[PDB]
Structure 1
C-alpha cells in the first residue's frame, strides 16, 4: 500500500545473510528496490535473494579487508551498470568479555568488522556515487550500546560509537555531493534465555524488537521522504536508554 518508493534504487546491504541484514533486504525489495546482498557466507546471502523480480545478486566480501571492500563496489557497478544509490551496512559481530580479561583478539576482531568494515564500505560507496555524479543515501547500523556502553562490550560499544562519528563526518563532506549519511540505533533484537527475560523488563515497552522494525527506519532513510535528514542518528530501542 503506497509503497515502492524505491523503484529506481540499487540497494547494497552488507551482512545480509541473516538477522537484521536479511530483514532489510526484504523490506527494500518489497519497495521495488534492486537489492545487492552481501555477506561473509555466499550460501547465506544467496538464500536471502531467494526470499526476495529485480534480478538481484549476492556477493561475498570481507568488509574488514580493504581489497574485498573495493572489489565489492566494482562488481556491483559491473553487474548493474551503476553504483548503489542505497548502501546499508549491517555486517557486524559481538565478542563479549570483561575489560579486565578482554584479549587483543576480542578487540581487533570487533573493530575491524564493525568500525573499519563500515568505513571501507561507506568510503568505496561514496567514491562510486560522487565519481558518477549520482545522489544517494548511506545508512550505517550502530547499536544503542555504542552510545551509553554495556558491561562486557568494551570493543562493541567503542566500535558502534565510532560508526556514529564516522557517519557524522561523512554526512558533512558528502552533503555538497547530495549524499545523505545517517545512523540507526537498534535496541536488543531477537536475532541469532535467562538474560533475555531480564532485558525485556528493562525495556519500557516490555519486549524485544523485531528485525523488521529495524528495516522500517532503513527504508525511510533511504527514501526521498527523508531527503533533508543527514548526519542524524535514529534510535529503535523501544524506549531503552532513551
Structure 2
C-alpha cells in the first residue's frame, strides 16, 4: 500500500494533465428549435434538464407518470420562454409509449433529441427484493429505452439528425450492494448506449449523436443515502454541457472516469501497463 498509493498518485497527476492539453475549446452546438422529449421530467435530473433545454430555446415534450409534477415542470419551463407539451406516459409500458408517440407526432412533430431519464429503484438485498420490483426496474430503466428509441429513431435516421441521451448512473460501471437489480438495469443502459453508438457508426449514420449520463448519488430523493460516505441543478448543467459538445460518456463529476480505472486495475503489473500505455 505504501508504494501502491504513490503509483496511483503519479497516475492521477498525468491523467488530469492529458485531459488539460486536449481541453482546448470543444464546440458548443445550438439546440434552439429542436424537439426535445424528456422522460421522467416531473422531478429531479429530468425536471432540471427540461429547465436547461428551456433556457436553450428548444421545443419541449415532457413525459412522466406523475401528472402534477410534469405540469409543475412545464409551468416553470414556460416561464423561461419555451413551448412545452406534457404527456402522462408510463415509460415502462411498450403500448403506452407507442400510443403516446402517435400523439407526439400529431400535436408536436418528429422528436430530434430523446433524453431517456425515467427510472425506478427498490433498494433491498437480493432475497428481500420482490419479483414485481425486479421486473419493473428493467421495464423502466432499460426496456423502455428500447421502445421509445425504436419509435423515435426512424425519423432521426431519415433526417440524418438526432441525439439519443441515455441517463444511466455510476451503477452502470460499478456494482453497489443492496442494489443488484438496479445496477444490472443500469449496466444494461450503458450497454444499450454503447452498442447503439457502434451500430449507428456501422450503418454510416453520421448525424445521430449519443450521450450517456452517469452521475454519482444525487440529492433528488430517488434513494435516501449514498452508498459511500451533489445537487440536482449541477447534474442538469453537466448533462446540457455534454449534449451541446457531443460527449459520449458523461460522468458527474467528470473526474469519476479516473476512480473507475482505479478499481479495474486493482495486480501490480495491471497499473504498470496503464502507466506506459497512457504516456504515449
TM-score relative to the length of structure 1: 0.84
Is 2:171 aligned against 1:145? yes
The count of residues paired between Structure 1 and Structure 2 equals 223
Is 2:93 aligned against 1:77? no
Give 1:213's aligned residue. 234
Distance 2:165 2:56 in 1: 17
* Displacement of 1:59: 0.8
Q: Between Structure 1 and Structure 2, whose CA radius of gyration is higher?
A: 2
Give 2:72's aligned residue. 47
Distance 1:162 1:197 in 2: 21
1:178-198 deviation digits (Å, cap 9, x = unpaired): 211221101000002xx7488
Give 2:141's aligned residue. 114
Distance 2:136 2:61 in 1: 25
- Unaligned segments of structure 2, at least 5 residues: 1-27, 261-280
1:78-131 deviation digits (Å, cap 9, x = unpaired): 222x31111101100110110233221221111111111122122212123224
Distance 1:198 1:120 in 2: 31
1:28 to 42, 50, 53: 53
Give 1:233's aligned residue. 249
Q: 1:10 to 1:197 in 2, by over 3 A?
A: closer
Give 2:156's aligned residue. 129
1:204-232 deviation digits (Å, cap 9, x = unpaired): xxxxx122222223213433x32xx4xx3
TM-score relative to the length of structure 2: 0.73
* Displacement of 1:236: 0.6
Distance 2:184 2:33 in 1: 36
User: RMSD over aligned Cα, in angstroms?
Assistant: 2.1
- Unaligned segments of structure 1, at least 5 residues: 203-208
